[PDB]
Structures are given as C-alpha cells and as structure tokens.
C-alpha cells in the first residue's frame, strides 16, 4: 500500500495539464475577460478546475447541458479555436455596444470574447439569417446564447422588436427560443439573464441561425483536433513542474505498489485505490 505523494500537480507522461486557475469550464469556453490567459491553450493531459472558481459566467445565466459538456470535455485533449463568423461580418448590427459591467476587463465593462452581443443599429434590428458550413474534417463545438431582458422598455432599447425568437438548425438540432422577460434578482448587479447553448457540428454539416433579437451570436468555435482519456480534476494544489505517470487531486504518485490510499480519482497508470491504512503481506515466517 502506497501512502505518500509529492503533493503537486505534475505533467502526465510529458504533457502539461491545463490548469484553469480561478476560471471554470464555462468561463474558459465562452471567453470570460478574466480568463484571457486561456485564449490559445496547448494540448493538455488533464484539466484542473477549482472547487468554486471565481470567474465563470460573469453575466448571470446558465449553460445548457453544462455537465454533459464537461463529460464530453473529459474525452478531448486539444482544441483549435477558429473564427467561424467574424465580428466585422455584421454591417447592419451593432457589435461594439454589447458590453456589461458584470463582465469587467481591467475595470472597463466588457463581454465574453467567443460570442458577440448584437444590438440594434440605427434604431433597427434586421432579421439575422446566418449559416456556417463545417469544412474542417473535425467536429466543431459551437456556442451561442439568448439574452433574457428585464422589461419591454429594455427590450425595445436593446433590440427594437418586442416579440423575438432564435431558431437554430442542424441535421440533428431543431431549437426555437424566446426571451423570458420578467423581473428577477440582481446577480453581479444585473437582473437580466443569458442562457447559453452548445452543439457539435459534424464535418459536413451546417448550423443555420435565424433571429430577430436577443441573440448572442457565435464568433469563435473549437475544432476537436485530439481526443482520448482526459479528466477534469477538482484540486487547489499548485503546479510543481514535474513528470509523473499517476496523478490524484492531492498529488502525484511515484509507486510500483499495487495499492494506494491517496485519492479515489486518478489519471494515468495507477495503483488500485483502497480505503485502508495498512496493507502488508507477510512473506516470511514469524519472529521470536
């Protein structure tokens, strides 16, 4: 039975982990302004997330099927972020006014970087009809969203159209959304909400987006360029610049023993976990 670890997060067979620090999976994948360190992330062996990360969804709201997304993320080793719809491709909509004080960047109000908050321009919101075609030989992780406004006055002040929708359509996805305009509590100073959605686009499919308001449009998607045997690890331990073949959320294991009592959750070639304090096999006879 092995009972000792180095107490550090270390490399797994040469590949350094993705330590999200005080960011979450949603904050990294949506582009929180406090998470600009993870804009271009190399190939990782496992992802480290804290138990209660401070920088998540800066603007209050939700990420639909967030735990299913993290379960999918535990089988991906590398992403390639690509601009699928440029921010300069919106000539009839406002792309620079879509900022929030709930999403600060060095004091100034800002927004998620991988999606754009589209606002009416010249007191008009034309119907967005946008299609992207996947021509990249890899599956694409595409994230979009819907803003839920507070009142009808805000709804006309942001989008000019009182009753709006967002329709999304792929070979397997058929989504229709409407904003839920209602009074809510202030989270991060904002009573409004933002519901985010994700999909996987196959390498010869299209996503059709059509909306006349409240649309948080995708700008950046993620090519899944490498897959297989990752994990998401809840750990506050610091990265110690090591190499190891077995990692647990409290440290790395350097052992040829068949058992350990360190932590049930492990990654790599590891001993079998048992909740025992002593496991000693007598090999010789008894002593006088």
């Amino acid at each position: 039975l092995e009972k000792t670890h180095n107490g550090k997060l270390c490399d797994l067979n040469g590949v350094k982990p993705l330590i999200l620090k005080d960011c979450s999976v949603a904050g990294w994948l949506l582009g929180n302004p406090m998470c600009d360190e993870f804009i271009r992330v190399p190939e990782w062996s496992y992802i480290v997330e804290r138990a209660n990360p401070a920088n998540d969804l800066c603007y209050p709201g939700s990420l639909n099927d967030y735990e299913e997304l993290k379960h999918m993320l535990s089988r991906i080793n590398h992403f390639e972020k690509i601009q699928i719809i440029p921010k300069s491709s919106w000539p009839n909509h406002e792309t620079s006014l879509g900022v929030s004080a709930a999403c600060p960047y060095q004091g100034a109000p800002s927004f998620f970087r991988n999606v754009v908050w589209l606002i009416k321009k010249n007191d008009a919101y034309p119907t967005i009809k946008i299609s992207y075609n996947n021509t990249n030989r890899e599956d694409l992780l595409i994230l979009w969203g819907i803003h839920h406004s507070n009142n009808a006055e805000e709804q006309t002040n942001l989008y000019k159209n009182p009753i709006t929708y967002i329709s999304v359509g792929t070979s397997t996805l058929n989504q229709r959304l409407a904003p839920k305009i209602a009074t809510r509590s202030q989270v991060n100073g904002q009573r409004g909400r933002m519901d985010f959605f994700w999909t996987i686009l196959k390498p010869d499919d299209a996503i059709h987006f059509e909306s006349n308001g409240n649309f948080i449009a995708p700008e950046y998607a993620y090519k899944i360029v490498k897959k297989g045997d990752s994990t998401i690890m809840k750990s506050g331990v610091e990265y110690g610049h090591c190499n190891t073949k077995c990692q647990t959320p409290v440290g790395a294991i350097n052992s040829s023993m068949p058992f350990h009592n360190i932590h049930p959750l492990t990654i790599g070639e590891c001993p079998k976990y048992v909740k025992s304090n002593k496991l000693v096999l007598a090999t010789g006879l008894r002593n006088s």
Partner: antibody, heavy 118, light 106 residues
Framework: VQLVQSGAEVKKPGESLRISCKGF????????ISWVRQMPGKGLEWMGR????????NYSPSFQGHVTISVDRSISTVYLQWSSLKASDTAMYYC????????????????????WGQ | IVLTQSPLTLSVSPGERATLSCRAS??????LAWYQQMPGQAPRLLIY???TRATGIPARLSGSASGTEFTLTISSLQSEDFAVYYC?????????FGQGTKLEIK
C-alpha cells in the same frame, strides 16, 4: 429615488389643472406612485396610486370620479388632473413613491411611503 | 380603516419622554408607519412595521404594537422633535392616516 413636482398653482373654480411628478426611472422592481392631499391644518388623505409601467390605477372611493391619474411613459412623469376645480380642492399635494406588492418576513407588507416629492 | 390618534396636542418639556397613541378600527397586523412633519415640509418616515426605525432615525424613537393599539415613544426630547406626527396603515388600500399630533415645547 427623488421626486420633484411642478410649481404652485392658483386657479378659479371651473378650470382644469394638471400637476406632475417625476424623478422615478423605469425601475425594474414593481412600484407605485401615489397622490396625497393634505388640507391646511388637517391630516393626510390618500387619493390614488398608479403603476407607471403598465398604467394601472387604483382610486380611492373619495377621489374616484373627481381626479384623474395618468402617466406619460416616454418622459417618466405621473400626472394628476382636475376637470372642474372647486374651492375645496385648495390643499397641498404630494406624490409619494412606494413599492408594489412586495412582502417580507411573516407576511409584512413593504408598501409604506418611502419617498415624497416636495 | 379609521386611525384615531391621541392626544391632539401634547406639551412636554425638552429632555422628558413623550408618548403618542394610535388606535385602529380593524386589524392592520403591524403594517403601520409613523411619519414626522415640519411646517412647509413633506412627511418623512420614522417607523415602519410598527417597530422598525428607518435609516438615520435615532434609537430614542421607539415603536411598539399591542394588537390594534400602537405607541410611539420619544425619550430625551430634543428641539427637533417638536413637530406633527402621523400614523399611517398600509395593510389595505385605501391608505388612511391619523388626524395628527402636535408636540409643543413646554
């Protein structure tokens, strides 16, 4: 909030009058703006309340057919209207801000007059 | 709901304790407020919920409730306490006030 009303008015019987109250924004939280009449020397009398967001008005039975409470949602201003003034209408008029339908604790209503206009 | 206030005038020397009473006709279930008014000024909130002081109100202002009866106690009377006091119920609408109580310097 901070409520500001129009100036004092001197009128003859049979005239129509419109006083105003402003200083409230489009407050997301539900809220009432009320009109209060205070005769010189006497106490206070509640005339009616309006929600500026949806123009819903509740009138006192003593003031239902005599005064008209309206709102201009573009400029955020609540108006009190008389069609035919009388000598008994000579009194001080306040607009008061309170909250609409809010509760706390064990059924305590939070709709006391929290902000008055001069 | 009729709120009767007692007394209508009260002459108390400064530094002493003044007691104001307000009696309802029905039950208002502690949804009662106490306001103070100076000549020429709007009423300002002192007590809400028949016990709770507002922000800035000193601890010498005490609101108490006993069923239908409500009592406002001003201990250690300063020169800015001599004004007109009103009790207003907000349990139901129409909101009703008391007839007032003038506090006079003795």
């Amino acid at each position: 909030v901070q409520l500001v009303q129009s100036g004092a008015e001197v009128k003859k019987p049979g005239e129509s009058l419109r006083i105003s109250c402003k200083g409230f924004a489009y407050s997301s939280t539900y809220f009432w703006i009320s009109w209060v009449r205070q005769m010189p020397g006497k106490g206070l009398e509640w005339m009616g309340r309006i929600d500026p967001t949806d123009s819903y008005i509740n009138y006192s039975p003593s003031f239902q057919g005599h005064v008209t409470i309206s709102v201009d949602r573009s400029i955020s201003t609540v108006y009190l209207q008389w069609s035919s003034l009388k000598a008994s209408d000579t009194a001080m008029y306040y607009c008061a801000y309170h909250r609409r339908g809010h509760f706390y604790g064990s059924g305590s209503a939070w709709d006391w007059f929290e902000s008055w206009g001069q | 709901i009729v709120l009767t206030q007692s007394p209508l005038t009260l002459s108390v020397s400064p530094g002493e304790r003044a007691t104001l009473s307000c009696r309802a006709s029905q039950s208002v279930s502690s949804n009662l407020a106490w306001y103070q008014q100076m000549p020429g000024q709007a009423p300002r909130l002192l007590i809400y919920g028949a016990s709770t002081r507002a922000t800035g109100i000193p601890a010498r202002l005490s609101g108490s409730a006993s069923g239908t009866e409500f009592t406002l106690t001003i201990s250690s009377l300063q020169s800015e306490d001599f004004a007109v006091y009103y009790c207003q119920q907000y349990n139901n609408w129409p909101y009703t006030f008391g007839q007032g109580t003038k506090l006079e310097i003795k």
